[PDB]
Amino acid sequence: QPLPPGWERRVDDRRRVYYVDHNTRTTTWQRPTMESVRNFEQWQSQRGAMQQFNQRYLYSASEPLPEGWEIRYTREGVRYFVDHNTRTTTFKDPRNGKSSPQIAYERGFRWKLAHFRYLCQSNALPSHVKINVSRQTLFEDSFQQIMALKPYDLRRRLYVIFRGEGGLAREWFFLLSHEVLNPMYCLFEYAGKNNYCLQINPASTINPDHLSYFCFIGRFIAMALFHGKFIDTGFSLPFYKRMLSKKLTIKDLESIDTEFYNSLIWIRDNNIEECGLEMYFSVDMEILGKVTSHDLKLGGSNILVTEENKDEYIGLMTEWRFSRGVQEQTKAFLDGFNEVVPLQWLQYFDEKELEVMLCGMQEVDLADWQRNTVYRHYTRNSKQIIWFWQFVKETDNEVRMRLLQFVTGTCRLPLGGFAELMGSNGPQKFCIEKVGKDTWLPRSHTCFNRLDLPPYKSYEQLKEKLLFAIEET
């Protein structure tokens, strides 16, 4: 097998083959091709705008209790207790009935975030640990240093020393959170055009140490959470749902694999018998050239999909697509995370809260947003679009961010603003389309950054439906 210019084969002490590029000193376990070379070269996108990333930090300028309960305080200092399990509040301590106009129940992201910060603070160890990393070898050096430490050492103060040279911690987290995506390591890939929809790469097995690296990456993301630092890696919301052990759904599927979702949706909503569709309860996978067949259930490759059983086929295909080829990697990541921040500490956050905790949130440029929003079967003077922008103006940045996550599937905004907004198939501006009737709820297609907004009859109805849709799940 011939190799692109600059590259050479090498064999290590255990007779395992790897590859080295004598011009750029990169090494990889997967045989490079010109496709992978051009992929790597574009990925080398200064990996600068760290100062604009740092605005997230200034922006964040704001006996045990039974599970799911919180202590909160009213604006006048009055203690109350929130039961997330029943979505109610009381002034009566559930531990002992001691009582301090019942307070409206509310999700209260900021309260949950503050309790979590206290949880981390309560479990910090004293002193510091020092991480010595060469900036040009940042991934390999951070890996060696973190993995050499007992997980509890990761709960001390972090002193990062960039070889040959507080704010160094933020810079470490930002830079390394980009560095782990380096395709030469083979841990990740993208589902969409450009760098759209990150996911674990089933082919990471070509790296014999891939599970140690996924463990390290879990430890690293947990460390960002514990130390209150923000990362820029761009995990999907279904990935975070997996970290929360939440059920992954067909709607989740739309976010990460348009074609797969579209096929499943067509099978659900069409008579597959009247149109001759011939399908069975097994699926093929190809990793590193090798094809593998997987029965969805016992003997699945022999079971014809019919009108009678196709719902079961659909659920099994959804589950399979979410977990295919990445079970071990995902476990390694979860394990590494859990030994720094117990996953149980996340139990009452949703996936969008988790993403904002990891990524930090910015203030949204309402003018840039509105200047770069496009419409389908609406115009800027439709009553519902005027109501939309009135609702966006009338609310706070938390709701705006939650709406942003609803429509685009993420809280991360592009460096160039809403004109540079990206979808799975390339550039794709925020879009509001007229669908359905005023009795529907809004819906979103995050691959196209598109909000289906029913044509409501009054501002207040638009407000209620919109708030309900962005709060949901």
Residue numbers in the entry: 381 to 427, 432 to 446, 496 to 533, 539 to 603, 609 to 916
Provide the authors' own sentences about this structure as they appear in the paper.
To elucidate the molecular mechanism governing WWP1 autoinhibition, we determined the crystal structures of WWP1 in its fully inactive (2L34HECT) and partially active (L34HECT) states at resolutions of 2.3 Å and 2.5 Å, respectively. In the 2L34HECT crystal structure, WW2, WW4, HECT, and half of L (aa 413–427 and 432–446) are well-resolved, whereas the WW3 domain could not be modeled due to its poor electron density. The HECT domain in the closed form of WWP1 adopts a T-shape conformation, which is highly similar to that of the isolated WWP1 HECT domain structure. WW2, L, and WW4 are organized into a headset architecture, with the WW2 and WW4 domains acting as the “right ear” (denoted as “Re”) and the “left ear” (denoted as “Le”), respectively, when binding to bilateral sites of the N-lobe, whereas L functions as the “headband” of the headset (denoted as “H”) by forming a kinked α-helix that is tucked into the cleft between the N- and C-lobes of HECT. Detailed analysis of 2L34HECT suggested that the intramolecular packing is mainly driven by extensive hydrophobic and hydrogen bonding interactions. The hydrophobic Met627HECT interacts with a hydrophobic cluster formed by Trp387WW2 and Phe420L. Pro651HECT inserts into a small pocket formed by Trp409WW2 and Arg396WW2. These two core hydrophobic interactions physically anchor WW2 to HECT at the “Re” site. Hydrophobic Met434L, Phe437L, Tyr441L, and Tyr443L interact with a hydrophobic cleft formed by Phe617HECT, Phe673HECT, and Met804HECT at the “H” site, whereas, at the “Le” site, the main force driving the WW4-HECT interaction is hydrogen bonding between His517WW4 and Tyr543 in the N-terminal extension of HECT. Unexpectedly, the “IxY543”-motif in the N-terminal extension of HECT occupied the canonical “NPxY”-motif binding site in WW4.
